[PDB]
Amino acid sequence: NLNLIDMKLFHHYCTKVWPTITAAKVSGPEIWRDYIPELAFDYPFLMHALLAFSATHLSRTETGLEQYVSSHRLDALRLLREAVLEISENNTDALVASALILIMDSLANASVDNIFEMLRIDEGLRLKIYKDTEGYYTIGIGHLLTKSPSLNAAKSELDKAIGRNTNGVITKDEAEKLFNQDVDAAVRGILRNAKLKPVYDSLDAVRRAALINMVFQMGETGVAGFTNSLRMLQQKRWDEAAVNLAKSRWYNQTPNRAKRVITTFRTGTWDAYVDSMSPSAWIFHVKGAATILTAVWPLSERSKFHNIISVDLSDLGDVINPDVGTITELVCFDESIADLYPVGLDSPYLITLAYLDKLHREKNQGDFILRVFTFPALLDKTFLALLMTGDLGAMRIMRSYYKLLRGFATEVKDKVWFLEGVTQVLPQ
Amino acid sequence: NLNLIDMKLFHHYCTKVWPTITAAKVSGPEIWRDYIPELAFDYPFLMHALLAFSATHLSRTETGLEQYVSSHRLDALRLLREAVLEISENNTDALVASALILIMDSLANASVDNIFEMLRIDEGLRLKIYKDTEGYYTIGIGHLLTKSPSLNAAKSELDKAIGRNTNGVITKDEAEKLFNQDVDAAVRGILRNAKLKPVYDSLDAVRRAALINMVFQMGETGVAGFTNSLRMLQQKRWDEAAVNLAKSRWYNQTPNRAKRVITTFRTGTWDAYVDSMSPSAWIFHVKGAATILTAVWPLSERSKFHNIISVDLSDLGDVINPDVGTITELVCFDESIADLYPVGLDSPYLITLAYLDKLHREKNQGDFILRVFTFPALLDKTFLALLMTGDLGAMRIMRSYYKLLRGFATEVKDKVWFLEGVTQVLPQ
User: What extra comment accompanies this record (chains A, B)?
Assistant: First the structure.
């Protein structure tokens, strides 16, 4: 009676994941290889943060896990919650580790779930029982509840699939619970299909979702019919594949949805969606970890992360206090957002654009990472409010900030997984 | 929550223990470092074993444990019990490693089953509830049950931490378990005591048992009264400390028990009890384990051990088939046993002397260690009986067996712990 799974993950951590932390030019092996493991045993919250991250990395070559990525992550927060009540009397080094581990974990799991977002845009999300184009009781995203003509029969199933009296009404979080089972089911089918299995395996995450999509719209055997375009895809003739599908009956039936799917295939990105995709959640998750970083800033040479953060990355002293007039010295980089310039006022959008600028100036491909990890948690209150409020302006920059990340990720020598979930680039 | 104690142990094994396993030659850093940890996550029975072993090694540096070492030990076996039920299936490499791990663990905890033997000869054993000649009552070795002058207070107390209703009588193992408790209880008192600790730490394991032996007899503070002698022992002035200890009221109150304990400090061996503590426990613990190291051969080529066992260790060969007559070709290589040669098919030490001979002839300390681990298993019935009856011949060949390990760990460049149990040769 032991957690052979916890021990495996931990073993996985001490074995295959830490070299990826160091390779990312984030701290050295001294600390990630020997120091953290030691600390883990003393501080439960760090151990949990550590297992969640491990689970995350292991599960890209091993099924099942997933739930561990979620529970440990939960516990890490339960414990971090009360560890932070009195920061100054805790192990600031353990805190720093936990936060950094969680950040990378959130990055790797950023794209996890936009498939659900993908179909939401493409098919629609219904929270209360309704009837499909055939009169059947469905719910969520095209989820069939029963071919029975009894509304209450539907209710029973709906309450069976979930675990409570829904009266035929569910919460978004249940729709996806259901949707995801449906993706699982679809996947099994693809794999159990000779014409589809090869192409599917051949495909990365983003492009796999785009195929699932087709399988959701036209049905399995339906998709198996695009044999020409399926080959191109297999052989990775992206551009070729896109042109071939653009001239199929599917395309005429539904051009707009076809275009989005085509592009996803063509580009390997969520480009065709993100704009219609609800505010990227990972931003908030990183924000809840990095904030820890900003709350310990800075500590004595006593803690061995002293020289690793390198200093306080919060400081914007060289661009705050100006001279004459209320116009700042920030120049625009990456135009088509120059629109927001010359930030000619010490008013909204400042602090954020000042940090984005230091993120662009940070050529030490190690402190650049930390600026990436730290960004979400440095966003000031005002701006932050605007970002959630939908303020189209403030969404604009978060996209250029997301652009720097992809740029970095691409140009980098040794590709970094985990920022793979947030930039694609897989691997090279 | 988590089970950090376990994870600490497993991590300890993956960083501290396995290298000790290669230093011998059971070796293959690719088995003990890589293969076994992995195999461990499958097959709980291998993990416990592995965890127990590692708990033991850590114990030579951490004072807790003991139970986390007994609990797993019982578990490793309890599970390995049901394991050999279905050898001819699953993976046997796990069963194989388990044995290799269990055997090594036994050898390391041989000085524990010995201390039971030392005080057996000295204090005495009694599987009842007698009233000691000190006023109160007792059980087993010297476990005080009822101080109460009453013959009934114990006849309504004894059975308390034994599981089954002991009623009044107990088995060997039932005393051992409670003896080892009192032992450790006593080691704690010693470390808590500032007069003795400085010496106790200084002492090796054999001598540590002599000091404990005194403790049991005359109490913690009583021993502290030896001051002059203690320091001496602390300065490794063996010979002197022995002379000085003789001059004492303890030497006279009880002379024999004193001589034995004296020469024990003097030489750091068990010479004084040589012929009174025979059934060196592990011989039988190992027996039920090291057996499956012979049963599994020949190993399928798929087994990662295909080359580590190699030959049929249980194979005598031609020794038992002399060209003419009944006297075997075996020739004496020790001397304390030349009295048993030439051997001769008659017996009764034939089989044992034969196996003992392959051991001695064994160059390439790889199969050497294996024959050592395996010897206890190869010991035949009719011989085993002679031994536990105190046959001088039997007991002598056993000493010749131990003389072989002693001369081996010594001569070898890198000394190997876990063998410090049988003939010393410590610590580096």
Answer: Present with 752 molecules/cell in log phase SD medium. ECM22 and UPC2 (in combination) null mutants are not viable.
Dihedral-angle region of residue A95 (phi above 0 means left; psi in -120 to 50 means alpha; beta otherwise): alpha
Residue A17 DSSP one-character state: I
A137-140/A143-146 β-pairing? antiparallel
- Read off the tokens for B32: 């003990």
Count of other CB atoms within 10 angstroms of residue A115: 23
User: Which of A6, A123, A220, A346 is flagged as catalytic?
Assistant: A123
Listed in sequence order, the residues at least 6 apart from B428 whose beta carbon sits closer than 8 Å to its beta carbon are: B415
Q: Which residues pair with B137 in a beta bridge?
A: B131
Q: Look at the block and give the residue holding tokens 């950023």.
A: A110
Residue in this structure with the two tokens 């959640």, named with its chain if needed: A281
Q: What share of chain B is helix, strand, coil (3-state, %, to 5)?
A: 60, 0, 40
Give me the residues of A, 56-75, that contact B with CB < 8 A: 75
* Closest CA–CA distance from residue B5 to any residue of chain A (Å): 8
Method: X-ray
Preceding amide of A255 cis, omega within 30: no
> How far apart are the C-alpha atoms of B3 and A6, rounded to whole Å?
9
Q: Which two tokens stand for residue A285?
A: 């998750």
Of B3, B11, B48, the CB nearest to A14: B11
Task: Lay out the sheet containing A137-140: strands in order across.
Answer: A126-131, A137-140, A143-146
User: In whole angstroms, what is the distance from residue A326 CA to residue B228 CA?
Assistant: 86
Q: Give the ranges where B13-146 is alpha helix by DSSP (H).
A: 18-24, 29, 36-41, 44-59, 67-83, 93-108, 110-122
Cα–Cα distance, A122 to A260 (Å, whole number): 9
Residue B155: CB atoms within 10 A of its CB come to 14
3-state secondary structure of A342: coil
Residue linked to tokens 């654009």? A353
User: B286: which residues sit within 8 A by CB, 6+ positions away?
Assistant: B102, B103, B106, B107, B373, B376, B377
Reported as type and span, the H/E element at residue A146 is strand A143-146
Sign of torsion, CA A156 A162 A165 A167?
negative
Q: How far apart are CA B79 and CA A372, in angstroms?
A: 50
Q: At residue A140, what are phi and psi to the nearest 5 degrees? A: 60, -135
**B340 DSSP assignment:** G
DSSP-H helix ranges across A280-424: 282-294, 306-309, 350-361, 367-374, 381-389, 392-411
Rounded distance, CA A159 to CA A148, Å? 15
Chain A residues 26-55 with a CB less than 8 Å from chain B: 37, 40-41, 44, 47-48
Cβ of B11 and A37 within 8 Å? yes
> In sequence order, which residues have a C-beta less than 8 Å from that of residue B424 and are 6 or more positions away?
B204, B206, B268, B269, B406
> How far is the first Cα of chain B from the last one, in angstroms, to the nearest whole number?
40
Query: Residue A201, exposed/middle/buried by CB under 10 A (0-12, 13-18, 19+)?
Result: exposed
